[PDB]
Amino acid sequence: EFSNQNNFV
């Protein structure tokens, strides 16, 4: 299981 989230501002 691979869970990934990224934010770029």
From Swiss-Prot:
Report which superkingdom the organism of origin falls in: Eukaryota
Give the record's PTM text.
The glycosylation pattern (the amount of mono-, di- and non-glycosylated forms or glycoforms) seems to differ in normal and CJD prion.
Where's it found, cell-wise? Cell membrane; Golgi apparatus
Implicated in which disease? PrP is found in high quantity in the brain of humans and animals infected with neurodegenerative diseases known as transmissible spongiform encephalopathies or prion diseases, like: Creutzfeldt-Jakob disease (CJD), fatal familial insomnia (FFI), Gerstmann-Straussler disease (GSD), Huntington disease-like type 1 (HDL1) and kuru in humans; scrapie in sheep and goat; bovine spongiform encephalopathy (BSE) in cattle; transmissible mink encephalopathy (TME); chronic wasting disease (CWD) of mule deer and elk; feline spongiform encephalopathy (FSE) in cats and exotic ungulate encephalopathy (EUE) in nyala and greater kudu.
Which family is this protein grouped under? Answer: Belongs to the prion family.
The UniProt function text for this chain reads: Its primary physiological function is unclear. May play a role in neuronal development and synaptic plasticity. May be required for neuronal myelin sheath maintenance. May promote myelin homeostasis through acting as an agonist for ADGRG6 receptor. May play a role in iron uptake and iron homeostasis. Soluble oligomers are toxic to cultured neuroblastoma cells and induce apoptosis (in vitro). Association with GPC1 (via its heparan sulfate chains) targets PRNP to lipid rafts. Also provides Cu(2+) or Zn(2+) for the ascorbate-mediated GPC1 deaminase degradation of its heparan sulfate side chains.
Subunit comment: Monomer and homodimer. Has a tendency to aggregate into amyloid fibrils containing a cross-beta spine, formed by a steric zipper of superposed beta-strands. Soluble oligomers may represent an intermediate stage on the path to fibril formation. Copper binding may promote oligomerization. Interacts with GRB2, APP, ERI3/PRNPIP and SYN1. Mislocalized cytosolically exposed PrP interacts with MGRN1; this interaction alters MGRN1 subcellular location and causes lysosomal enlargement. Interacts with KIAA1191. Interacts with ADGRG6.
Which miscellaneous remark does the UniProt record hold? This protein is produced by a bicistronic gene which also produces the alternative prion protein/AltPrP (AC F7VJQ1) from an overlapping reading frame.
Q: What is the UniProt domain comment for this protein?
A: The normal, monomeric form, PRPN(C), has a mainly alpha-helical structure. Misfolding of this form produces a disease-associated, protease-resistant form, PRPN (Sc), accompanied by a large increase of the beta-sheet content and formation of amyloid fibrils. These fibrils consist of a cross-beta spine, formed by a steric zipper of superposed beta-strands. Disease mutations may favor intermolecular contacts via short beta strands, and may thereby trigger oligomerization. Contains an N-terminal region composed of octamer repeats. At low copper concentrations, the sidechains of His residues from three or four repeats contribute to the binding of a single copper ion. Alternatively, a copper ion can be bound by interaction with the sidechain and backbone amide nitrogen of a single His residue. The observed copper binding stoichiometry suggests that two repeat regions cooperate to stabilize the binding of a single copper ion. At higher copper concentrations, each octamer can bind one copper ion by interactions with the His sidechain and Gly backbone atoms.
Q: What is this protein called?
A: Major prion protein
Range of the intact protein held here:
168 to 176 of 253
